[PDB]
Each structure stands twice: as C-alpha cells, then as structure tokens.
C-alpha cells in the first residue's frame, strides 16, 4: 500500500547501505535515493520522510519501525525543496549578513558568486555548516573562500549605524540598502559576466524589500531570489554566512582594540557590564563609536556605570 516513517541520520544511512541497489538520478525533488524491490518502492527524504509504496509495503516498512504508519502520501516533489532542486546546480550570488542583535559592533552584510566549477570545492571545504561552526572554522575556512570565489561586503560601522537608526531607518531597511549595495558590487566585479540567479537570505518579505529601495540610483532585481534558510537552497549564501561571520570577527578585534577593552558578542549581562565600564573609562560619547545606542543595553549600562 503506502506507509510512511521519519528517519534520523543513522536510520537514513542503514536505509540507504542496506539495499545494494540504490539510485540517485531521476529522483522526486528532495529525494535522497529510492529503491525498486519485488512489489515496493523506497523514497527517502533530507526530511527524513520515508516513503514505503508497493506491494510489500507495511512489509518492508515495518523491517524498520514497528508500527509504521501509512498515508496516502506519494513519491511526488517536496515543496520544500523545489528551488533547491532548481538553483543548487546554478552559478549564483548569494548574500547574508550578521551582527543584527550584537550590541557591540557593525552590521555586515555579504555576498559570494559560486560559479559551477566552483561549487564542489566550496562544498568541499565544508561550507554547508555555517550555522554550527564555532569562531575558529570561520577563521579557516573563510580565508580559503575570499580567495577561491569571488565576493564582496558592505560593513555598516556603528556611529553611521547609530545615524540612520536615529534618523528613522530601522533594521530592516538597514539591511534591504546593506544587501543590494553588496549585490551591486559584486555584479559590477564579475561582470562581463552574469549569475544565473542571485540568491538573498531571506529576512523580510520581497515586496518590502524593494519598496526600501525606492531611492536606490542603482536597483538589482533581475533573477534575484529572496529565500528562507538560503544557505541550505545554494552553496554560494553559506559562502556568504562565512564570510560576513568573518570580517565581523575581524572587525571586533579592531574595534575592541580602538576601545581599548574586550567587546563581548550578543546582548546579555556581560554586554551592560562591558558598556558600563567604556563609559567610566572613555566616557559615554564613546559608546557611539562601538554600539548600536537605540539598544536597551545602553540604558542598563547607564545605570550599572552611575550606581557606582
Ligand atoms: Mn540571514
């Protein structure tokens, strides 16, 4: 009939070594492999949906689970993976940015053309982790992507931070402005040629994004893609990711270095004890040099340096 299970990693990789059969062309968009056994048919997922359809299905199934469920449910394309299955074989740009909910530091927004020939070894380095990858990966494997691809980056230091914030320009039109600022350098640097897609993280929704570029002189719109959880959709937005972690990070030592005292990430307590003590060092004007002032930190900073 047809029955259905999920399947964590290990149960994907006994599926897949078990049959000596496996096949990865021609395959439902999200696919992993399937598997064509007397009267059954496997499909497995990146999910880890298995789909059993066939004769032998509960039968086979159940060599797995007990008490497998069964839905109606076909080995049909996942909409979750239909642009993936589209863009991830392209030559693109893909762009994303960090530092948005650090109190401490810029807003840096990046891009990295990945060219076909280039996507293996970009993937080959491992890029497809940037979402876990501590401060040290980044400080490897950064390096040896600036210099293999061709990319480009907008920083967004804090006193122009602080300018735009108090002059109206929230976050989100912050980033629509740093993103295609990014994009349009890089379009210019490889030009004469042209990506066949320009992928951007998504973190708004297309139509504001392009509404805040109303003012733009230059406006890049043509085969753009604006994507939830890009870097899993193309290897050329965890390029980015990287990249953007990476000039962060180097942009921290230098500013910590300029304040002249260790500027920790995020928001919390050690934030607030951090401003305090700029303050009662450098004086206050200073944190406009190094902080995003709108922040709640900087009130609770405030107090913690004038209670004592
Ligand atoms: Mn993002």
Known sequence: ??????????????????????????????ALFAVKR????????????????????????????????????TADHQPSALAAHQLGSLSAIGSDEVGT???????????????RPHIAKIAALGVKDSKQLNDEAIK??????????????????????????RSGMPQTKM?????????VKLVDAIAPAEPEAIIIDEFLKR???????????????????????????????????????????????????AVGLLLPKGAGAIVDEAAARIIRARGEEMLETCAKLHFANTKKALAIAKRR
């Open 101 to 115: 909910g650090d109190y401490f530091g810029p807003i840096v927004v990046a891009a990295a053309y990945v060219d």
């Open 140 to 165: 490897r494997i950064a390096p040896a992507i600036m210099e293999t691809v061709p990319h480009a980056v907008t920083v967004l230091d804090n006193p122009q931070y602080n300018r735009w914030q």
């Open 175 to 183: 980033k629509a402005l740093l993103h295609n600022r990014t994009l």
């Open 38 to 73: 007397p009267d059954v048919v496997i499909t497995a997922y990146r999910s880890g949906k298995v789909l059993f359809q066939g004769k032998a299905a509960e039968q086979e199934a159940a060599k797995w689970i007990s008490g497998a469920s069964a839905s109606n449910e």
């Open 207 to 257: 139509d504001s994004y392009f509404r805040y570029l109303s003012d733009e002189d230059r406006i890049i719109r043509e085969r753009v893609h604006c994507l939830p959880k890009a870097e899993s959709v193309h290897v050329s937005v965890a390029a980015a990711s990287i990249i953007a972690r990476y000039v962060f990070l180097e942009e921290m030592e230098q500013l910590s270095r």
């Open 1 to 30: 009939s047809n029955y259905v299970i999920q399947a964590d990693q290990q149960l994907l990789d006994a599926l897949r070594a078990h049959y000596e059969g496996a096949l990865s062309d021609r395959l439902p968009a999200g």
